Every structure is written in C-alpha cells, then in structure tokens.
C-alpha cells in the first residue's frame, strides 16, 4: 500500500491528546457551550475500545482496562483543560458500522460497562461529565434504513445502573413516539433525533404536536449543495407549498409528545435546555476544500433553521481536531483560525435563537481515506496494523 495502516506509538497518542485539548479550547473560545468526544461509530477512539480492531500488546490494548485507556485519557485531558461541565462523551456499544464488533463480541458489554464505571468514579470525585451520549442497538449502522440493523440481543440499559448522570439516546426514535414516550419516563434521559432533523428543521414543534414528518433525501446527506441542506420546509411552509400526505412520511402515525418529559426543561452542562429533543452530530460534507472550512454560504442558515425552537441542544457535525485526525475533504476542522472564524458565526446564530451548541471532536483512524492522507503527507492511523476495516 502507498499509505499502509500504521499502529500509533505512545508519543503519537499523546500528540492526538494535545490536539484534542487545543481543539476544545478553540471551540470554547469561539463561543461553543461545550464539546462532545466522539468515541463511537468505529472511529479512532472506538477502534481502541474494540477488541476486533485493537490487538495491541502495550498499555493501550490486551484487556478491558487497557482498551479504555485512550478514551479515558482524552476525557481527563479535556476535563482538566475546559471543565467537566463542558465535556460529553459519545459511545455506541452495539454498533457494527466501520467494522466494530457489536453484540457478537461476548465481552462488549463489559468493555462499555468499564468505561461507564470509570466515568462514575470521576463523577464521585466532582468531575461528572455533562452527559453520556449513546447510540442505541436500534441503529447498529446509520446507513441502513430505519428498522434495519436493529439488534435485538442487547440493551443499553446497563449504563443506567452504572452512570448516574444525564444520558442522551439516539437511534430510530422519530418514527417511534411510542418508544420515546416510555424511555423519557426516566427523568435523566434525552432523545437524539438525527435523520429526521436533517429533513425537519422544525422537528421539535412536530414532536410536540404530533405533526406529519418530511421525508428525507439520502442522496443529499453528503453533497456540496444547498439542496437537501437548507431547503427542507417547516410544517407551515410545506402546507403553503401545497404538500400533502405524499410529501410526508407514508403510514407514519404521529403522537403528540408535549405531555411527556421530552418537553420538560433540564440542565445539561451550563445550559438550561427547554426540552429534551437533541440534535445529534450529523456530518453533511458541505465544508470547503482545501482547508476543511465550515461552509460560508449555507452552514449558518442550516444551523439557524434547526435552532429555531428556543432551548434546543445542538451537537455539531464531527469536526477534525487536526489535519492528521482527518481524511474527508469536505468535513470541517477546528484547528485553524480560518475554520474558527466561520464556526464563530454558526455559534452566534444558534445563540441568537436561544439554543445551545456542542462541538463534536472527531478523529477518523482507519475510516479515513488513505489516499487523501497520502496526498497531504499524513499517516493512515489506527490502533493496530494487522487488522483492517472490512
Ligand atoms: C448523514 C449522517 C451523518 C452522521 N454524522 C455523524 C457524525 O458526524 N458523528 C456522529 O457521532 N454520528 C453521526 N451520525 C449518526 C447519528 O448521529 C445518529 O446516531 C444516527 O443517525 C441514528 O439516529 P437517527 O435514527 O435518529 O438518524 C450520522 C448519521 C447520518 C445519517
């Protein structure tokens, strides 16, 4: 291979940690309310957590404790740098996307239970993270249609026995208000809505009142276009455009969720949320190349539209902490001044709408395109060098 997969040295791990710290500082300085550490969906930190991808025989692999080391080191570094109430963590225990193990690995629950335990231990010491964000076994692969890749053999409920702080849960909840109604009975549970927040800028209103949902268009999830980004209508706008039952999701039977805890306020980090419908991180690939710069034409509008319900928590699309952490030309970064100038405008707009914004800090590992990295003189990184993405 022109850019063969490289097993990180300890010094290189330390360098990533340094970059996470700087990226977090950059985000806060630009106006972000906090950061989310991406340790899910088969990216670098998840590659260390997972025994399929991590075959290391040093202190970063070979046991549950060792596999959790990198993730916990990033947590600790960020808590020290910017404060515990400005840091969250995302995990996907049952995910198989990007060649992670999922439930087929009998030790997977123990691996994640250990992480949760260590977070609770830190919480007892007065350093409780703002939240833990879980992808549900409802969606083990987000590129499969709702209802597909639903793992029936495991639950994330174990996390609640261990971690005693806020929990955001994401995965196929928009089409299932009956499930949400039950899950939000737990008073520290928030619900992330991904794909349907792409297509419904006023999703929160629609959830409250039980309105029909705009269909989403997969083909414009990742595209350099305003189309499928900023041109999805609100419900009132849709009706004025003459949209009928054909433009909305077919055979979906909405429920008004306004009478549930989903519409009770809750404090997350330093923010008083007015409801518990969260926008999870959603990569959209509108960032400019070269430079991984947030889009100057459409991004402010995209986030403004989705911030429209006051007191909404928004987690940004994954943002690279450094060039070496990247490998997708059209995903944004948070390492450079030219990037932060644009992020500042995005954060401004969200705050104008009385909503909140958390930057997801992203490192790709083996999910990167090695050819892009090679072009830029960068390594193709992962936990090991003898196991590869499918
Ligand atoms: C187009 C798209 C982009 C996504 N980008 C990210 C991302 O950048 N970071 C992340 O942690 N998850 C990302 N996800 C996963 C979602 O946050 C979410 O967990 C998943 O879509 C399931 O929720 P849903 O059924 O409500 O869409 C993405 C999903 C989609 C469909």
Structure description:
The PDB classes it as oxidoreductase. The entry lists the keywords circular permutation, catalysis, OLD yellow enzyme, flavin cofactor, oxidoreductase. By secondary structure, the protein is an alpha/beta fold. The chain has one domain. The protein has 13 helices and 13 strands. The chain has helices at residues 10-29, 44-49, 64-67, 69-82, 108-124, 158-162, 177-183, 195-199, 203-209, 235-240, 299-306, 337-352, 370-375; strands at residues 5-7, 34-38, 87-91, 131-135, 167-170, 189-192, 266-268, 271-273, 277-278, 313-315, 319-320, 356-362, 380-382. β3, α5 (108-124) and β4 form a beta-alpha-beta unit. α1 (10-29) packs parallel to α4 (69-82) and α11 (299-306) packs parallel to α12 (337-352). Bound molecules: flavin mononucleotide. Flavin mononucleotide binds at residues 38, 40-41, 90, 135, 139, 142, 170-174, 193-195, 221, 280-283, 317-318, 360.
Short description:
This protein is α/β, with parallel strands linked by helices and 390 residues long. Helices cover 31% and strands 13% of the residues.
